[PDB]
Give the backbone structure.
Amino acid sequence: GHMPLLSASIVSAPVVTSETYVDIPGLYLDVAKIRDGKLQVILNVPTPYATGNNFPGIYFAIATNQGVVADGCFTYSSKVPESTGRMPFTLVATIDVGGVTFVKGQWKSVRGSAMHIDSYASLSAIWGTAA
Amino acid sequence: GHMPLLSASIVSAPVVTSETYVDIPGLYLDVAKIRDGKLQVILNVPTPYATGNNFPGIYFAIATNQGVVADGCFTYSSKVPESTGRMPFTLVATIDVGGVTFVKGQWKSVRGSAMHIDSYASLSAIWGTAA
Amino acid sequence: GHMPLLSASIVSAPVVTSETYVDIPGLYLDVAKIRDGKLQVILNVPTPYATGNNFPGIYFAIATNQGVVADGCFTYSSKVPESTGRMPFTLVATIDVGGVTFVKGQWKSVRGSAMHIDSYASLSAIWGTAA
Ligand SMILES: CC(=O)N[C@@H]1[C@@H](O[C@@H]2O[C@H](CO)[C@H](O)[C@H](O)[C@H]2O[C@@H]2O[C@@H](C)[C@@H](O)[C@@H](O)[C@@H]2O)[C@H](O)[C@@H](CO)O[C@H]1O
Ligand SMILES: CC(=O)N[C@@H]1[C@@H](O[C@@H]2O[C@H](CO)[C@H](O)[C@H](O)[C@H]2O[C@@H]2O[C@@H](C)[C@@H](O)[C@@H](O)[C@@H]2O)[C@H](O)[C@@H](CO)O[C@H]1O
Ligand SMILES: CC(=O)N[C@@H]1[C@@H](O[C@@H]2O[C@H](CO)[C@H](O)[C@H](O)[C@H]2O[C@@H]2O[C@@H](C)[C@@H](O)[C@@H](O)[C@@H]2O)[C@H](O)[C@@H](CO)O[C@H]1O
């Protein structure tokens, strides 16, 4: 149709620790399957947790073929929290589509944390034009 | 008009405890008042808190006539926190409108928590098409 | 173009304490540079922290020429946390453009907190119509 909404959602990912950004499997939009204008991209990870022994947390990024375009993180406020609580995370970025063929979510450990998704997470994009 | 933006906002809700998803009163979009294509729905509860004595928290869901389409939660990282801090929460889901007549926000207790909204919260939807 | 996506992003702001809402520098959309219909506005501050000695936190607002349209906050759950963890924050509001010429992000201290952004934050708007 004429006003594309793109969405990918997952409910889990294998638990991993990574020093560097690695794809969150399943959070991937094939944009080439839009060639001009803009995409407002939301990465929504509403119920993540991190396990670790040095102020755990998770960095998240939005990436295209051109690499990371935006990132951010949550961290706990204790070195070893009593419980690794669920720390809702959302990241919003707008990309110029004019060598972008895909958008994806990525994550990376804070201080060696293991990264946990065990429920709904999504990557969404709304197509628009420049002003 | 030709590119509908839907929005509902509230500033409070009666405090309740619920084992199961119950509507957050006022976060409701009448979609039937769109019949094809997609809605990107955001549930934004930026300043909630939970009270309780067993690692309190709140689950939130986006639901249509067809039930819950996405959910997630925040939880505290202490069994009884010193203070029940404000834990911003956002949830994003894209729905195929092709027996959807309404979208609403819902919530449910984590471990018997009382659920508190006492400031701005919103439910938003942007209409688009399949790709 | 015919379906404008507006975006502004920053990676830092001078650290300040404020009793009242002050602009977050750089999170500003010139809307007048749209005169009818709606804007869905997202303020995304994914990696803020607050420093303070009385349950620190940050309030955030979306404002237009007409003032604040929505706000919310995060707060820590300890009076003086062991570490001031990163507390992702998102705020979503829909505005009727019919004396709006700009949209901006603002912030304000919780209990005298110093306010910290030292990585990506964004303010985004998608143009639509009434239903
Ligand atoms: C409070 C806490 O951290 N509990 C951990 C247990 O996690 C809970 O497990 C039960 C099933 O027995 C439920 O699945 C519950 O949803 C789990 O709690 C959720 O996840 C944890 C990690 C926290 O984020 C909590 O706030 C959230 O509600 C866990 O099964 C055990 C062993 O792995 O550790 C407990 O500390
Ligand atoms: C630190 C704390 O939890 N304070 C609680 C009190 O809540 C504050 O009340 C004052 C008015 O006296 C303000 O309204 C302030 O905004 C309230 O704090 C906010 O809400 C609490 C629940 C926390 O989320 C806090 O971080 C947030 O800023 C509360 O009135 C009393 C009794 O109910 O308990 C205090 O612990
Ligand atoms: C755990 C913690 O709070 N550490 C604080 C230090 O902040 C870390 O500094 C290192 C560089 O040495 C990195 O830049 C790291 O990313 C910083 O941690 C990040 O920011 C702090 C404020 C927390 O939000 C943390 O969770 C987050 O990962 C800081 O440099 C020093 C002195 O200012 O204080 C430490 O407590």
Notes: Chain A touches chain C at residues 3, 37-40, 42, 55, 57, 60, 70-79, 87-94, 126-131 (CB under 8 Å). The CA atoms of residues 21 and 108 of chain A lie 5 Å apart.
